Each structure stands twice: as C-alpha cells, then as structure tokens.
Amino acid sequence: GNPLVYLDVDANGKPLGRVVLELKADVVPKTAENFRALCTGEKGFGYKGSTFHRVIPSFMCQAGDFTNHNGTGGKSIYGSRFPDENFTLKHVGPGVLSMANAGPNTNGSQFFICTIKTDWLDGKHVVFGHVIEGMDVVKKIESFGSKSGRTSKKIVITDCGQLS
Numbered sequence: 001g002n003p004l005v006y007l008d009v010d011a012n013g014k015p016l017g018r019v020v021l022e023l024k025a026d027v028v029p030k031t032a033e034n035f036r037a038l039c040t041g042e043k044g045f046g047y048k049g050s051t052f053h054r055v056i057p058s059f060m061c062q063a064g065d066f067t068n069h070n071g072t073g074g075k076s077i078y079g080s081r082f083p084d085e086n087f088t089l090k091h092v093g094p095g096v097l098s099m100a101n102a103g104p105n106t107n108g109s110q111f112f113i114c115t116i117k118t119d120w121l122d123g124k125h126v127v128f129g130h131v132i133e134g135m136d137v138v139k140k141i142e143s144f145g146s147k148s149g150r151t152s153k154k155i156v157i158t159d160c161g162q163l164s
C-alpha cells in the first residue's frame with residue numbers, strides 16, 4: 001500500500017512526539033517517492049536535522065529546507081526541482097500534507113502540514129498525503145508560530161523514516 005512515514009519533532013531540544021504521514025503514492029507516485037526517500041535519508045540527504053522555518057497559526061507549518069535551513073533551499077531526489085505532478089488531491093482541512101513551492105513546477109523538498117482548510121492553494125500546491133497520527137504534535141508546532149511565520153522556539157525534525 002501507500003507509504004507511512006514519520007517525523008519526530010523537538011521544540012527547543014524537547015521532544016514533542018511523532019507525526020505519522022500517509023503518502024498518497026496511488027495518486028502522486030513521484031511526489032510521494034521523493035518525500036519517502038527524504039524521510040529515510042537513503043540517497044545520502046534528507047529531512048533529518050532540518051527545521052520548521054515558517055509556522056503560521058490557523059494556517060500551516062512549513063519545513064524541509066535541509067540545504068540552507070532558511071526557507072530558500074531544499075532539493076529533491078531527482079534534482080534541484082521537479083514538476084507539479086497533478087492537482088488531483090485538494091487542501092481539504094487540517095492535516096493535509098502538501099509541497100511548498102516558488103511558483104509552478106518548483107517542488108524540491110520543502111513541504112507543509114495544514115492546520116485548517118487552505119482551499120486557495122488548490123491548483124497551486126501539490127497535495128500528496130495527510131496526518132495519520134500526531135495532530136497533537138502539529139498543534140504544538142503551530143502554537144510556536146506567529147503571524148509573520150517566525151517561530152518562537154527552534155523546531156527540529158530530529159529523526160524521520162519509513163514505517164511501511
């Protein structure tokens with residue numbers, strides 16, 4: 001079936017717990033595979049040690065720039081950027097997992113987890129999974145954001161990988 005992956009997240013060095021994500025490889029196999037491999041680190045790089053750099057309460061938590069650790073970077077397993085696979089899945093509510101981007105066809109590694117329905121992103125960001133377990137952790141992360149997106153604690157993906 002579809003991959004299940006995990007992110008273990010700290011805030012200021014204290015563990016918050018685990019976010020488990022289903023990756024909808026049935027719908028967006030290329031996008032799912034990228035995220036899966038970045039979780040395992042099997043290509044020699046990935047999310048381990050990277051941060052949630054932009055967190056906006058009542059919107060989303062954004063992470064995954066493991067190259068510049070500032071929100072301008074990240075890379076995919078295919079190369080620096082890859083195309084928008086499709087817009088078949090929608091930003092339906094809290095827990096949606098979607099690719100950050102800098103315009104059409106600029107998926108890399110940055111991603112976000114929604115904390116509300118973000119319908120205005122439909123057709124612009126590729127949705128590729130959702131939270132299976134750990135929305136409590138996501139709500140904790142969210143609570144350390146701000147209107148500007150600046151985080152008030154250092155939020156780090158300490159560990160990540162594939163469950164199935």
Ligand SMILES: COc1ccccc1[C@H]1CCCN1C(=O)CNC(=O)NCc1ccc(N)cc1
Pocket residue numbers: 060062071072073074081099100101102106107108109110112149
């Ligand atoms: C204030 O944040 C947003 C406002 C409107 C639309 C989207 C966003 C944020 C949160 C949801 C995802 N998102 C973005 O992707 C904004 N763009 C972004 O952060 N671009 C940096 C970037 C650089 C390279 C790559 N590969 C991906 C993203």
